[PDB]
Structure formats: C-alpha cells, structure tokens
Amino acid sequence: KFPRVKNWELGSITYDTLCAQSQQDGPCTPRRCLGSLVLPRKLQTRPSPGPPPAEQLLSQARDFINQYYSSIKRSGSQAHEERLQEVEAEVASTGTYHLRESELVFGAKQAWRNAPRCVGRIQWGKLQVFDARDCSSAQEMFTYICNHIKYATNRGNLRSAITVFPQRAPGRGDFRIWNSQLVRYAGYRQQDGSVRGDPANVEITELCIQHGWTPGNGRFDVLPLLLQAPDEAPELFVLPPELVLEVPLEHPTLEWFAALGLRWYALPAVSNMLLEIGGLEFSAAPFSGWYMSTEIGTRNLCDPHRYNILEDVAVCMDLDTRTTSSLWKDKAAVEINLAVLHSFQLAKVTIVDHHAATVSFMKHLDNEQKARGGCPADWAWIVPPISGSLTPVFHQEMVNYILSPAFRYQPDPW
Amino acid sequence: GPKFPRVKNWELGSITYDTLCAQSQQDGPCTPRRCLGSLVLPRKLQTRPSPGPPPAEQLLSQARDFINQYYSSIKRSGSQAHEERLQEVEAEVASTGTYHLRESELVFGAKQAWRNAPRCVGRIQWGKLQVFDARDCSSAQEMFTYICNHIKYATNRGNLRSAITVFPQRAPGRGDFRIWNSQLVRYAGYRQQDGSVRGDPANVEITELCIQHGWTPGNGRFDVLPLLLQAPDEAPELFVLPPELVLEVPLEHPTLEWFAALGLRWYALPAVSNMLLEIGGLEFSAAPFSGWYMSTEIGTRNLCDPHRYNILEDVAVCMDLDTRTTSSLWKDKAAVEINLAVLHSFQLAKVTIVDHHAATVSFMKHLDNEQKARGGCPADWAWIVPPISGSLTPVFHQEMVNYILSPAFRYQPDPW
Ligand code: HEM
Ligand code: HEM
Ligand SMILES: [Zn+2]
C-alpha cells in the first residue's frame, strides 16, 4: 500500500504515505513503466468550450478549500464552513467559481511544492505572487510581465515569482503566452537546414516574424513576446533591453573562452505551463526563480540539438576529439559548467551549482517526510545531467505521483 | 494513433511505438497512481525461496509459453515437432512436477534472458554468449571447477568473452545450488575498530561470512575474496581462486604521473553470481554470467560512490582542487580523471573495456535493431544512462519503456 523508499548511500528507509492522497493518474501501469516520457499521452488538458461536471469541479474545490483552511489552522472554523458554502453556491449557479487572493497565493506555493520534476523546492515557501486576474488585454499582459521581470531580476539578486493571469472559462478562448519562456534566444533556419541561434526556438522565432517581427541575425537575439487575449490573434511586444539581464560567459583560467562570445540570460521564466488550483485552471501563469548551472552549461549549451558547443570548446582545449575514450566531451562539459558558475558569480547574479542544489533537495525531502509523510519526486529530472552519481539524490529512491494544486503541460495555442 | 506506448527521442525528434510490451506477462511495481521505477529492489520479480512445489498449472503455462518462444525462434511454430515437445513437457510435469530443457532450449533461453534485461546497456552483444551447460554438477567442489573454467574462458588473457555457466535448476524438495558471493571476483571489506572499513564497504557481510567459514583474512584494500559455494542441502564450502586466474589491472593516469602511486586497481572480469535465471518457469538459482566492463562501473561507481571506495576527495586533493566549495566542481573534475585513468589503464593492459560514450551509442543501435526485430525493447532509463556525463550521451535523450519479459534474470534472496 505504502512504498518503502530506500537511500542506498546511507541505508536509511522511509515509507511514502502521501502518495495515497493522489487523485490524478500517471502514465504507468503494472504492465509497464513510462516514467521516462516527458509529456503525457492523454494526461493533457482538453479544451474548455463546455463547463466541467459540477460534481467533479465541486469535489476538487472542496478539497482545495479544505487544504487552505488547514494551512492557516482554521479547519472547521466558521470561516471555513462559510467559504465552502460560497464555492458551493457559485458552482451550482454559474458552473465555476473564483479564488480569494489569499487562497491563490497558497495555491501557487503548493503547486510548486508538489512539482515532482523541480530540484529547487526547498524554496517553495518563498514565492512572490502577482495577481493579474484583473487583466483584460494583451497590452496589459505585457505590462504585468515587464513588472514581473523587473521584480524577479532585482538587478541580479533574483527573487522567485509568479504572475497569474485570468483563469480559463467555458466556451471562451484562453489567455496565453505563446513563448515557452519570457526570455528566449531566436533560432533562424538557414540555407542548408542548419540553424543560427537556439535550434529549440525555430518555430517560435518564425511565428514572431510571421506576426510582424523584424528578425535579427545573431546567435543570442532575445525574442519578442507573442501574447494572446481570449479569442484574439496574438500581439507582438518587444522587451525593453534594459529589463533583460544577461551574463557574458568567460572562464576562470582559460583566457580564450571569452572569445567564444557566449552568453546567457539571468532569468529562467517558464511561461507555457498551466497552473491548476482547486479545479480552476490558469492557462497563463509565468513563474521564475534562478538557474541551476547545469541547465545552461550542460543542457542549453551542450545538448546536440541545442547550441552544441562541445566540440568547439574541446578543440580550443586542444583535446583529442578523435576518440570517445579520451573523454574529451566530459572534460569540455566540466569547463563549460565552470565558466557558467564563474561568470554568474562574477556578474553577481544568483545561481546554484548542481551539488549545492541536490544537497538542499535532500534536506527538502527530509522536511517533507516529517511535514507530509512523503514527497513526489521524478528521479530522472532531479538527478543532474552531468555527474549524476556524484550527487546525493542519485542514491535516493523516489516515488513519483500527482498532487494538486499542480503545474501541468498544455497544448501549444497554435 | 497506435494504441501502444509512444516513445520519443528528443534529440532526433523521431517517434516509435512499443508493441513488445504487449507480450509482458509479469507485472512491475508501477500503477496509474504512482511510479516506482526508481526503486532498485521492488518486491516484484523477487524470487523468494518457494519450498513447496510450484502450481503445476502456473508452471505449465510458463513452460508452454517458453516452448512457443523457442519454436518461434527456429521458425517451426505450429509444426508437429512443436506440438510433440509441448506434449512432452506437459507429460513430464504430470509425472514429476517439473520438466527439463533440451540443450538448445537452454542456450536460447539464456540469450533471451540477457536480451530481455532492462537494466543492461550492453545488450547489443546479446547474440554472442558462450553458454556452459553445467546441469550435471553434483558437488560444491565441482562447482568450483566449472567456475574456474568459466573464468579462464571468459578472461581469455584480456580479450574478454561473454559467458554464462548454468548449474542445476531448483528442484522440488531439494536444496538450491548457490554461489554466496554476489560476484566471482570481489574485494574484501574489513570493518575497523574506529568503525570505518578497509577495502570495499559493499562486501563487509560476505567478508565476515568467509571468515566465519574458516577464511584467514588479509588486511589490504584489494584482497580478492574466496568463494562460498553451496551444493543442495549442504553447508557452503570455501574455495580460494588461484591468483593466476584473477586478472587485475593496476590503475595509472595518462598524464598525471602521481596517480599510479595511489596503488589503486580493479579486476578485469565482471561476473555477477547471485542472480536467478528463470526460463519457462524453471529456476536456475546458480547461473553466474559475465561480459566486460563499461568504464563508469569502475571509475565512477566502484571508486567514487560515497559508500564504496569513496576516493573523490583523495584524488581532488592530489589535483590540488578546492574541496571546500561545491562551485569549484572538484568532484566533477576528479571523477573525470579517475574514469580516464581506468580506460587508459585497461587499454594499456590490453584488457577489454568500453567507455560510456561508445557503450550508449551501441545501445542506441541495439534499440533500433530491436524495434525492427520485436517492436520494442524493455529499458530502465536510470540504469541505462551513465552515472557521469548523462546528457552528453545519446541515451539520455531517448525515452524508454520498462517492462518484464521472460526468460529473465531476477533478484533472489541471500542464502544465509
Ligand atoms: C528558485 C530556484 C529554482 C531552481 C534552481 C529550480 C530548478 C529546476 C530545475 C533544474 C528543473 C528541471 C529543468 C529541466 O530539466 O528542464 C525544474 C523544473 C521545474 N520547476 Fe523549478 N526551480 C526553481 C524555481 C521554481 C519556481 C519558482 C517554480 C514555480 C513557482 C518552479 C517550478 C518548476 C516546475 C513545475 C518544474 C517542472 C517543469 C516541467 O515539468 O517541465 N521552479 N526546476
Ligand atoms: C558485454 C558486456 C556487457 C556490458 C558492457 C554490460 C554492462 C552493464 C552495465 C553497466 C550494467 C549496470 C551495472 C550497474 O549499474 O550495476 C549492466 C547490468 C546488467 N547486465 Fe549487462 N553488460 C554486459 C554483459 C552482460 C551479460 C553477458 C549478461 C548476461 C548474460 C548481462 C546481464 C545484465 C543484467 C541482468 C543486468 C542487471 C542486473 C541488476 O539488476 O543489478 N550483461 N550491464
Ligand atoms: Zn513507472
């Protein structure tokens, strides 16, 4: 019934009783495990042209409201009962309801806390929540986003934040941020099918040009935002350069590294995920924190389908790229990650290396074991892309399941 | 689209569908409610010592399935020979409660068990396996003879060859044939007075057991342990492998001249000996198998794990790195040089070994061969992706479906 979770480095064991609280199904079954799949096959988020079953929504809303009053130690109180009646009354008459700002803040922090793929959850309690539900146009969306960015960047002393735009509504279009992140580098397809810039942003880069953007021709051209108000074509907005903090990359001892002209933005702000609280869905709720160095140094810069700079760096390090056994890729990867850490640290911009991050996550696991009797975690995403076993989480067994409030993937708006 | 798991490779953007999972007849530890795919030992395949004979009804369905697999493999499914073998197996089980495999069936089954192993990245070599039939073995002493021959053949003075020796299957009522050691070659772990361990911390229990059985312990960091071999219904017997038969490689670094002074070393032959081989319901409690090493097993796991030799700090200090701060990536730097030393040394000693890049690339080829040959390949992502440089290898970006197919290698409880 309850999974026996073991840590192989310390020989310690714990039981996850929290997983019993899961109400949403994952992709696995006794016949086969599909935990390595990035996106769901069916756990997607189908349209909302029609109102969701009142009974279903109501049970989800009740659970959430129950969670909320439990957090403020007022479960069973008069306020708790009166709130349930309000939600009850509104759903029965309108088919939906609305959250009080206090509940929204609690819900956003809980969704982060429940995110199985995030290694930085020790920070879950520290999140600035901007209520943008009073937004009625793409222009206003742009203003909220600029304020979010300014606040979150804080001149290099990054502060986690989330801005919540209006919830989805039946038979009405969704408020959406087309870009997958608030700050992305353009990806331009060139003559021979190759790509200049970030190969992962080719499609979005094209949509931007398609919608009137005058494209650049560099390797790190910050993309403009395509923001969409309900049932309207997306509108193009260019982010004020002074709002986009970037860090020039250089190496602590390799004088030539800087000559590579590499750089990366300071703010990691996912903008394409859906936030679900008490059955309510927020199709546009950009969130941000700070980077873990491997995200930039290993994945963004070294992935084969990304900037793929491994060989360039290897050649500059005069390594033997003639064979795999020389481990030239491993050596280059380490120096690139070192350059990222050194540079962000030099530019006084918040960043965390994969060792510090995993160590804090182990602490989080312990805190959660005491607080809730478990912690949903997705091993493949918690263990860093390099030096996996050199970190504590590698040797820690984990249980993965879905708790709500939650952040979920949703279909591309186009 | 197709009603089977959709598997994607995020590097190539290609998609495939796994239809082979449809053939699994054994459940794993996951459910729609939660994924337990990271658990090393989930009480699923766990072949607990089942004293009372197995349900003749359950044994037969498993046996029939295996025979169908075997006849399918030789392209004679539905033939008269197929139906006759099926009748022979059912008859044998009827009058004895069990049955026996023909020589070729055992060979086929051993290879399929390796082929079906979700956690093995070396499966592109699956078709090349020397299967030693030792089902005539009747004593612990004879087990030692078979094991020594296996070691000699497999080691082949450095030009390693994959092999498996199969001892008698579990029999109703009679005790099991067992090799107490988890591997044929292991280094002793000696508990110290201060509580620390000299040697391999992973082998403290087995080391103590060997001592308790008359072994006179050494006091080194790399003392090869003796074998505790157990024949049916007899206490385990102790056997010391002749040094000349255990090929080892002293570790040195290609450029860091001082690394050789560390006195580190590792043995050439990775031979797992505590796993159970299951074929058509029959259980081979003693069926040690071996291939060759993938460098990270030695350089990253065995030498750098916190609970193993834990040499990361020593090497970093030798490289004069800043071990007082994580952002210096001293752990990452030292791990890289330790792995390079392993590859370098094995290559120098002319002992077969494969680096994690070459291995994962060959596994990708294996996945493609298997997609065409069986419509899928059971794979455990966490075990397939190397412990270092994960995303620098192609397997990291490949989604994988994990499920249990039989014949298979399963975990079994310790004999003691
Ligand atoms: C403050 C420091 C933070 C750090 C260092 C951190 C780090 C990470 C990392 C490394 C990943 C995996 C990235 C990948 O492989 O693509 C991740 C995923 C995630 N993080 Fe965090 N995180 C932080 C803040 C946040 C915040 C503030 C939120 C939300 C309020 C959040 C929500 C998530 C979610 C939902 C995922 C999984 C997304 C997916 O499934 O694609 N994180 N985080
Ligand atoms: C040809 C060379 C081979 C290589 C390079 C290779 C490599 C590996 C590696 C790296 C692992 C995971 C090690 C760990 O994390 O503990 C593994 C696991 C495994 N391999 Fe292979 N392997 C090879 C040959 C074999 C052979 C010949 C067999 C059997 C006939 C085999 C059966 C397995 C099994 C069953 C496991 C999983 C055991 C467990 O769950 O602990 N391998 N292999
Ligand atoms: Zn699973």
UniProtKB/Swiss-Prot annotation, chain A:
The modification Phosphoserine is found at S48. Phosphorylation of Ser-48 by CDK5 reduces activity. Zn(2+) binds at C28, C33. It is found in: Cell membrane; Membrane, Caveola; Cytoplasm, Cytoskeleton; Golgi apparatus. L-arginine binds at Q181, W290, Y291, E295, N300. It comes from the Eukaryota. Heme b binds at C118, Y409. (6R)-L-erythro-5,6,7,8-tetrahydrobiopterin binds at S36, A380, W381, F394. Residues 32-414 are annotated as: Interaction with NOSIP. Homodimer. Interacts with NOSIP and NOSTRIN. Interacts with HSP90AB1. Forms a complex with ASL, ASS1 and SLC7A1; the complex regulates cell-autonomous L-arginine synthesis and citrulline recycling while channeling extracellular L-arginine to nitric oxide synthesis pathway. Belongs to the NOS family. Produces nitric oxide (NO) which is implicated in vascular smooth muscle relaxation through a cGMP-mediated signal transduction pathway. NO mediates vascular endothelial growth factor (VEGF)-induced angiogenesis in coronary vessels and promotes blood clotting through the activation of platelets. This is Nitric oxide synthase 3. The lineage of its organism: Eukaryota, Metazoa, Chordata, Craniata, Vertebrata.
UniProtKB/Swiss-Prot annotation, chain B:
Zn(2+) binds at C30, C35. Residues 34-416 are annotated as: Interaction with NOSIP. The modification Phosphoserine is found at S50. Phosphorylation of Ser-50 by CDK5 reduces activity. Heme b binds at C120, Y411. Coiled coil: none annotated. L-arginine binds at Q183, W292, Y293, E297, N302. It is found in: Cell membrane; Membrane, Caveola; Cytoplasm, Cytoskeleton; Golgi apparatus. (6R)-L-erythro-5,6,7,8-tetrahydrobiopterin binds at S38, A382, W383, F396. Homodimer. Interacts with NOSIP and NOSTRIN. Interacts with HSP90AB1. Forms a complex with ASL, ASS1 and SLC7A1; the complex regulates cell-autonomous L-arginine synthesis and citrulline recycling while channeling extracellular L-arginine to nitric oxide synthesis pathway. Belongs to the NOS family. Produces nitric oxide (NO) which is implicated in vascular smooth muscle relaxation through a cGMP-mediated signal transduction pathway. NO mediates vascular endothelial growth factor (VEGF)-induced angiogenesis in coronary vessels and promotes blood clotting through the activation of platelets. This is Nitric oxide synthase 3. It comes from Bos taurus. The lineage of its organism: Eukaryota, Metazoa, Chordata, Craniata, Vertebrata. The gene is NOS3.
